Symmetry: D2
């Protein structure tokens, strides 16, 4: 039968493009979402119009809490419930906002570290326990040149590098590859003004523009494919050279 | 007036050696501890015998929880109440145990991520808000070749790298330097069989032995000294070459 | 119509697999060789039997010397002469042997540093000067956990990382991407699967493709996880 | 007996600061130089005035060539000839200039790769062969992974130096020889650089918006050669004021 994939935070933007490209490649998809119900349902409808019974939505908050393990188990279970298998997990969902050193701080910890690291970890556990299997984590090419006042976000993304490597090592004997894709400047925030978007675009050596969502998705497609079957623990930057540019 | 330092997890082993060396260098010290009250008090009494009114203890659990921010604020406050200033923070305390992918898992997250990452972040916040100022984080030289089945621990230590770098950037305008010291094999568990300890020792190129706690402390002393005044965001491996050895 | 690629050290092993996959993808290829003329020509014969006049060979010593810049210019020129264009350069040729700290040492420098770093640099210059363009450098997944007594080899592979990054930055305004593929059994995490030259070639094919159009300065490890395994 | 150190490119700037601080710490020093004879002799004179017979000069070109191994052997031999021992080697000397991808190029290779990588390698060989607190410190570059535009050969050389530092740390560990690096970001700007251009670089540095002094770089070298670094080998300490953490 057709393989199946879970994509977190798949209603919009990069996650949406990943889900679309996996579906185009022949995967059945679980479209996870948190608040964006209308967009998730609209995407599932579009994919099911192309091939019936190949897309479902699954709602969950990925903030850390004592119920997060159950929520993550339920996302994986939702893929088995719909499709009878779960071949690929893409950890894409992510909270992102500044947390200056100088919502409560514990809520910020729960959101930023939960979505970017703890939920990927718990999803990884549940994915492995429930079993070309692979996991792709959406990292950040700027993790070692971080944005000012984004400590908790950056901590979460560093933790995700650690998970990628640790899980690659530990899950290799189960035939599960674990890799990352690290955007630099990709889709800018909807709320960001044009001037500020252009400041970011002008930093990029290759073309002075952000990555499209489809360009990020292309790297995910490579990593889950048969053409990457000896690749595990690798993080592919898709950053147009941004990370190589000094201050 | 003598400077003052907070050392977390200072009752035993590496933290104890760091507290002793800072004291020998002329610092007054807050000896933070969790369970090791007798050893913390013994150390304080030894240091106060050497010079009166130069050491106090401060008990706190550094597991993540709703109350962790207040606990971390209180640790920094204890230094100001005892000594009128807080010049140095050493984030040494750390939980360390395996968490296989295949205590509840959320307790393990709270302990491993809390001690290794969130508490350092909150302590950093409190240290900075309350202001040769510097912070030293105890990292891990093997963070990119992790031990099998230690994913949460490894995630925590990766997050600590991210904190070290983010905080170095953000706190530089306030004159606060933020660095790390990354042991490889240092003090092994007393209960570990010598035959297992020897397997670790023989991996180390430089002398086929573990680092003493004092050798780790020496790097901390350098980083807080005037001889490191331009150094921020650096993580110094103290590993005898271990991290350079392939499988 | 068809794009063209230069692959150094293409007669055998990884370079051969790369040349074959590029050719199967629709590239015309220059098969560079130093000593392996028979094997280079045998490969060209195989590829030309599939599509006439789509593979040529080019001899060059990639050891550093006074004549290396001209030799590297000729490799690139051979692609333009045969095919009228040069879209892809794969810096695959490599020398590999120990050089203990405790052939003359300067011959070892010329071979190890010259083949592994200087020739890639000179080829990069000549490729860029003559202009979906890209360069792929064959790196080492274990560059920061080096083999004992391989100092000069390791130094050259480090230099190649620096070239990859420097050239990605400098050549971005010309639309030339520059990336790397870093190859690495009971110790290999993915050791259930045998390592193959084809797996390395698959990563090269990805990097030269339109599916990697935003990727530059990236080095993809294809090592079964080996670089993650501690001592 | 006082230990002895070789510092390459020690007539001026960071190399002189390292030689001075090693001498202040009690080392006898070989001040290697290439073209800066007056400055090298002036320094040796100052150091010998402080303590007689504790400094000598040694001239050598560190460009790669078929004689470079003999030259490097001779630099180490000069330390033994003067002082009867050689405890520390500091690889500081460095050619630095752009080599755009779009002097002959082979001369540029010989100079940039010779000074920054091959000479350190040969000096490391000779130091180990001629043999307690023995160590080597290589002067690296904190910006090695965010390189300056049009500096590919220089950057290749500095990358190679990282590889040497790591390879030599592993291989020489059994002999009790530690091998480490110090990686400046912005330290002393070129003498010929205009003030406005210097300020462009200074303004990038998070910690103080200023370059590292030569002494600040030397402080890290002194730590690495000291007993306080006895378990440290294969480490490269950035001394960069946070520069390498700053995004585009
Ligand atoms: N865009 C870039 O330039 C860029 C740069 C570097 C790295 N990345 C990484 O690439 C990935 C995709 O980036 P993006 O910009 O497309 O992401 P995004 O739009 O900021 O976030 C993706 C989705 O994450 C979900 N999410 C946020 N908080 C959540 C929570 N508490 N629980 C569950 N889901 C939650 C949201 O789902 P709902 O909308 O359904 O609520 C959101 O649509 C992220 O991991 C990001 O860190 C992106
Ligand atoms: N030893 C090594 O070989 C090695 C290797 C790599 C890195 N490191 C790092 O170097 C540092 C020191 O290592 P070590 O071996 O000396 O550490 P350790 O003995 O394992 O732990 C140090 C102290 O951490 C405190 N701690 C643990 N859980 C805590 C909690 N929930 N709340 C508050 N404090 C807690 C404990 O204090 P109480 O005893 O008072 O309860 C303990 O004594 C650590 O950061 C470690 O990760 C060490
Ligand atoms: N094999 C591995 O496991 C591995 C691991 C890490 C990295 N790599 C890298 O992957 C690439 C290919 O590996 P490989 O094992 O296939 O390489 P290889 O067979 O060791 O060498 C490939 C070719 O390089 C050419 N070559 C060697 N010295 C030369 C010189 N002085 N001038 C010109 N050409 C010269 C030879 O061509 P002729 O035969 O025509 O003379 C040789 O066939 C290399 O860059 C290597 O460093 C491989
Ligand atoms: N300054 C910075 O901001 C900075 C930044 C990053 C890294 N670093 C590194 O730190 C070290 C010291 O920097 P610096 O600015 O003080 O260096 P520098 O002044 O540029 O050069 C130091 C010395 O190198 C010697 N040298 C150059 N070419 C030579 C050759 N062919 N043979 C022998 N010696 C040669 C010169 O000796 P003579 O004068 O006797 O001819 C020169 O005085 C260098 O390794 C450098 O790459 C410095
Ligand atoms: C170049 C990278 N990028 C694009 C971007 C856009 N969306 C993103 N989403 C997630 N989850 N993760 C990311 N890394 C991400 N990145 C960026 C980089 C920086 C910014 C920025 O300055 N701010 C500041 C104010 C915003 C806010 O919510 O304040 C409450 C947070 C965003 C915005 C976007
Ligand atoms: C070589 C590094 N090292 C020494 C060590 C010893 N203590 C440590 N403490 C902290 N907080 N962090 C560390 N990295 C650390 N490391 C090691 C390395 C590995 C081990 C090990 O096999 N186990 C398995 C069983 C142990 C247990 O019973 O719980 C305490 C958990 C640790 C023990 C010590
Ligand atoms: C911020 C680091 N820095 C200071 C500096 C100053 N001197 C240095 N010397 C050596 N050997 N190595 C270094 N890395 C070094 N760095 C820099 C960084 C960049 C530059 C620069 O734009 N140029 C361009 C013009 C110069 C020239 O054409 O000489 C012929 C080459 C150097 C100058 C100095």
């Amino acid at each position: 039968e057709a393989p199946a994939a879970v994509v977190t935070g798949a209603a919009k933007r990069i996650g949406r493009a990943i889900a679309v490209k996996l579906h185009q490649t022949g995967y059945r998809v679980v479209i996870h979402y948190h608040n964006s119900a209308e967009a998730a349902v609209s995407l599932a409808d579009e994919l099911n119009k192309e091939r019936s019974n190949t897309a479902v939505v699954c709602q969950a908050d990925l903030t850390n809490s004592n119920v997060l393990p159950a929520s993550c188990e339920e996302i994986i279970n939702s893929c088995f419930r719909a499709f009878g298998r779960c071949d690929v997990l893409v950890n894409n969902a992510s909270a992102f906002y500044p947390t200056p050193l100088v919502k409560t701080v514990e809520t910020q910890v729960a959101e930023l570290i939960g979505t970017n690291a703890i939920a990927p970890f718990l999803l990884t556990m549940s994915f492995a326990q429930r079993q070309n299997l692979s996991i792709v984590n959406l990292c950040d090419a700027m993790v070692d040149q971080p944005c000012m006042a984004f400590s908790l976000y950056n901590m979460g993304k560093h933790a995700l590098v650690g998970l990628t490597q640790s899980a690659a090592l530990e899950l290799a004997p189960y035939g599960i590859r674990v890799n990352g894709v690290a955007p630099g400047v990709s889709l800018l925030p909807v709320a960001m003004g044009e001037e500020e978007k252009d400041k970011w675009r002008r930093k990029v050596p290759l073309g002075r523009r952000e990555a499209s969502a489809e360009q990020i998705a292309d790297a995910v497609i490579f990593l889950v494919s048969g053409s990457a079957q000896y690749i595990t623990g690798s993080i592919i930057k898709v950053d147009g050279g941004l990370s190589l540019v000094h201050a």
